[PDB]
Design a protein around this ligand. Structure first.
Ligand SMILES: O=c1c(O)c(-c2ccc(O)cc2)oc2cc(O)cc(O)c12
Length: 238
């Protein structure tokens, strides 16, 4: 992700077919002549989309120009969580399914996977970062404590950020329970809170290279959100 100073980021299109699909998703959702109520509501939960972008001298080099969801924070604490039971899409080959399931074989059981976090620590004036192997190591026994780490500034558990995250996720969950036209595979939620309040918490959906038309509720996504809500809720009892 390329963080530009004017409060936006540039996300480079993934190689085909993934980048092109993510481009088309943003184009469908943010079509100026769109009056589909489902899609207009979905806009609230995504980064604001500014269209395709490429460098002036390089029309070959394709990016999405997107809102920087961390812009309004001073010391943003950021967690990326992949949502759903299946990280592979409805047209994946046998090998691709195996590739995806092997990355994290607990996806069906847990319904979400922590892709990373960056946590500001007050008393050291520094960030602790966790990479993809952190989340991939978490089991049903360790997921609650694994998620909890995101909300530890060193001195207190930020239950305010936990509660606000639940409240923001619940609105996304409500959107999913009132649409039967899109199914989302390998998509994520980006959580941001202020590390330096309730207060600023941001929760946005990202990563749309495997969103497909559907005739049904996205059951895997709903399962993941519900399980994530339940884990966060249990952290409020700590
Ligand atoms: O706005 C965005 C953002 O700030 C970040 C980010 C910033 C710092 C990190 O350490 C990790 C991610 O990722 C993104 C990924 C997207 O697909 C879309 C976005 O709009 C953002």
């Amino acid at each position: 992700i390329l963080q530009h100073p004017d409060g936006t980021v540039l996300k480079q299109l993934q190689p085909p077919p993934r980048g092109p699909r993510e481009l088309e998703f943003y184009n469908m959702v943010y079509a100026a002549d769109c009056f589909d109520g489902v899609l207009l509501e979905l806009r609230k939960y995504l980064p604001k989309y500014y269209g395709i972008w490429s460098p002036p001298t390089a029309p070959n080099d394709l990016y999405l120009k997107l809102e920087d969801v961390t812009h309004k924070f001073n010391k943003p604490c950021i967690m990326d969580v992949k949502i759903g039971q299946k990280s592979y899409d409805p047209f994946a080959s046998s090998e691709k399914i195996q590739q995806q399931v092997s990355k994290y074989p607990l996806m069906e059981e847990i319904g979400f996977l922590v892709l990373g976090m960056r946590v500001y620590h007050v008393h050291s004036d520094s960030y602790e970062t966790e990479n993809q192997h952190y989340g991939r190591s978490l089991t049903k026994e360790t997921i609650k404590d694994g998620v909890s780490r995101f909300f530890h500034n060193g001195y207190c558990l930020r239950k305010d950020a936990v509660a606000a995250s639940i409240q923001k996720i619940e609105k996304i969950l409500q959107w999913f329970e009132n649409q039967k036209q899109l199914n989302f595979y390998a998509s994520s939620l980006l959580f941001v809170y202020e590390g330096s309040s309730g207060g600023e918490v941001e929760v946005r959906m990202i990563d749309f290279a495997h969103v497909f038309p559907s005739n049904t509720i996205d059951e895997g996504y709903v399962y993941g959100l519900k399980h994530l809500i339940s884990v966060l809720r249990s952290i409020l009892d700590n």
